[PDB]
Amino acid sequence: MQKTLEVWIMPNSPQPAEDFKALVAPFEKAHGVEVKVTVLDWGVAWTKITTAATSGVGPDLTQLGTTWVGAISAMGVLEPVDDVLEALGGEKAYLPAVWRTTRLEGARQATAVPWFSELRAFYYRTDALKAAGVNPAEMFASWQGFEAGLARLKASSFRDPETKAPLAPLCTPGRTPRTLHNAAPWIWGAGGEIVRQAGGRWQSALNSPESLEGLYFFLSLAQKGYVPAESLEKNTAQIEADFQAGKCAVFASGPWMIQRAQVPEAKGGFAERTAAKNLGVAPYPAGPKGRYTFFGGSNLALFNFSKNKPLAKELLKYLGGPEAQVRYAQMTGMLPALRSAWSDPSFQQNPLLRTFIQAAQFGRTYPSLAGWGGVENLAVQHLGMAWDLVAQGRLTREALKDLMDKASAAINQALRHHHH
Amino acid sequence: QKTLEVWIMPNSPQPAEDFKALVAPFEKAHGVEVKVTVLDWGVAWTKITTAATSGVGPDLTQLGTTWVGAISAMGVLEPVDDVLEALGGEKAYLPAVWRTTRLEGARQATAVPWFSELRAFYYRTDALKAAGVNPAEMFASWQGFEAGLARLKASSFRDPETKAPLAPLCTPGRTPRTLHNAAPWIWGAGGEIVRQAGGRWQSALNSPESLEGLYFFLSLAQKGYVPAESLEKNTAQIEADFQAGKCAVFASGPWMIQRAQVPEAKGGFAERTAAKNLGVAPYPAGPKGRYTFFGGSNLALFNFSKNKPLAKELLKYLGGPEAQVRYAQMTGMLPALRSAWSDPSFQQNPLLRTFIQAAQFGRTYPSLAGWGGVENLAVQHLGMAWDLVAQGRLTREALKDLMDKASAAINQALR
Ligand SMILES: OC[C@H]1O[C@@H](OC[C@H]2O[C@@H](O)[C@H](O)[C@@H](O)[C@@H]2O)[C@H](O)[C@@H](O)[C@@H]1O
Ligand SMILES: OC[C@H]1O[C@@H](OC[C@H]2O[C@@H](O)[C@H](O)[C@@H](O)[C@@H]2O)[C@H](O)[C@@H](O)[C@@H]1O
Ligand SMILES: O=S([O-])[O-]
Ligand SMILES: [Cl-]
Ligand SMILES: [Cl-]
Ligand SMILES: [Cl-]
């Protein structure tokens, strides 16, 4: 009689359950085990997983957003996995920013295994930058280059072959709960932070001089006319669609866009579109105090009430290990969490994927705080209010500061009060 | 027989029956009978404060969000940080909802969010089109909002059923709930009702910013955008005016969408032109932000309950995704649990998706032990301002004199 494992996942791929079943079929056959998968929508998964955690009833393994690992770990419900991580190559096998997501900030033991990475780089229309007299090497080297290329792109008379209309220099989604991830590399590039440690404790640094320098740099590009009004009312998926449809010279996204450029519109790609035929990518530019690439993605964790910790740890080793890492990265359009998988020919043979790997070298993530959730909700609320000012062309440095002082007061309250 | 006692307010069309249907799977899972008592809002206030003073009551009681401070300060509520952690803690709630879980500045949570009231603008897509008003522009900013109202007053459009023109905006000022209508204009202007600054709580109703927002809103009626009859009417009469084709624009909660889908015989308005030409938009950005008024109700557990562990299990069930979606449908409210909005029920209606967009700007009153006295004073003096508005008599100086007066009484109350 087959042994049993349960895994909870979020919709990471086109057929989430079927794809995950294909991924683990070799493990099932090797260990005489059936892996039962349950797919949770990203919006409900957190509450289902905290109910599972507190009730002691749920799967053996659960997917976690990297930003979730601290909160769940602090609940005391996760089995240590330093053994699994040592088996996969240890701390050297991971980008530093990925290794940071294996534990609660400052915790003694690892409680999550890196599964896949989300990271962001600039896609750009090679035809638009040429028509504008912009060298992508200079546009994506520095903030000065970045703004100077957007200026030339706003001036350009170039029209998309299919829309027969000019392109927005830059598109960025003004309407999303994931707005912080888009701001983070500007905050970081200026020497800033969203939170930082002081007086025995974590606090907001959103109102620091450097954070405010980076936020204003980024948000002010929109008030300078480089971002259309229309973008700031749109979500991440709408902005991707705008870039495929020739509306945007430049936008930030993950590696998944490359695969979409290879497949026809009917298959949910955009290979027929001008943008697919004129596609470049660049890492985020260096800011005044450094160059940072936002990283997110998902990790896997083992509940301490699992009835088969050794077999589940074999599944964590399989899913975290070289073959599964390359296959699931293909299925999801993500970057492997395991550094060694970046050397796979399926990344090295595509120059656009090679660029994502160059951008990966600058990877940076949020501190893995037990209270990150509340921090991010408060930051997102106030960032939303800053974009409103940008839409009316009313974002001053002073008005930005007043918004971030307000966010900082609420974040510091949240951090002080984080339960248990 | 395991039993729990729960006190609720009339939140749904058959309050008791609907609540019994909601908990029936909990009752069956745990062999518990949940005994529900429905109390009208005023009656509930007296009985809950008596239960708090006497140590005799139900296990669980519904509280208005704005009641949590007052009842918590009486020291009678069991902490529920554990229940809230099970439901996903601070992450699983909008920040304005999370604030209603405790007395302002308290460490420990004492109430569990049950459902959220929030306010957005409903509009006649046909009326706006006939007036040459773009709803995304009209509802982006105060400037767009006033400009759209002016065009709507000028329009020759007539409701197809009434064969008569539409009032540009309908709102009450004949209601004890007048502060909730005013709150987003106060907040949009950079104002507040009360502010903690300088080490204590104080009225900010006479702040330049609060006065700029109050006057912006109240003056729209004197400019001819709100008809005379609207100011003699309560919240339900304004709903009826909009369903009957009399109003281009009015503020309500998500229940109107449900009602637009249901025939008049089932207490909806699906047959009426307004149901067939229905749009929703968030409140507009003011000079210092965009804010959506949040209220609603929470559940609390009395610390004298003999059934605290079982009651906490019922708190987890009622606060959790399945019961959160079902009770939002029964009441026509938004779930308090942000996770529950990911239910197909919400994601699969464009009008409800717009409420969830407006939800991102959620704001609530501070969870003050003395809130009710603060709100009574604010509502008395706002009521006086609306009386002047009905007579076309409001000035910035008259408004200021009224809010100076409310602020003196509020600061005494807060001391
Ligand atoms: O915020 C939690 C978690 O979010 C992760 O991304 C979530 C996001 O994933 C997209 O690819 C998907 O299309 C969206 O529907 C979904 O919301 C993120 O990578 C993690 O770092 C983060 O912890
Ligand atoms: O002030 C207490 C409490 O009031 C709640 O509003 C009550 C209100 O709800 C309507 O849906 C109902 O039709 C009215 O008759 C009833 O008065 C409010 O949502 C809470 O935030 C507040 O604390
Ligand atoms: O109408 S009865 O269900 O309270
Ligand atoms: Cl962006
Ligand atoms: Cl940070
Ligand atoms: Cl306030």
mmCIF file of C-alpha atoms in Angstrom, chain B residues 11 99 155 162 235 238 320 323 345 395 402:
data_model
loop_
_atom_site.group_PDB
_atom_site.id
_atom_site.type_symbol
_atom_site.label_atom_id
_atom_site.label_comp_id
_atom_site.label_asym_id
_atom_site.label_seq_id
_atom_site.Cartn_x
_atom_site.Cartn_y
_atom_site.Cartn_z
ATOM 1 C CA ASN B 11 -27.696 42.325 10.092
ATOM 2 C CA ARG B 99 -7.454 48.822 14.117
ATOM 3 C CA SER B 155 -27.912 68.090 -18.433
ATOM 4 C CA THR B 162 -39.825 58.876 -14.561
ATOM 5 C CA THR B 235 -30.107 56.419 4.587
ATOM 6 C CA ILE B 238 -31.963 57.930 -0.284
ATOM 7 C CA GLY B 320 -12.747 32.191 8.629
ATOM 8 C CA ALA B 323 -18.467 31.643 6.918
ATOM 9 C CA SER B 345 -18.248 35.172 -5.143
ATOM 10 C CA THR B 395 -20.870 79.994 5.498
ATOM 11 C CA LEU B 402 -20.148 75.205 14.999
#
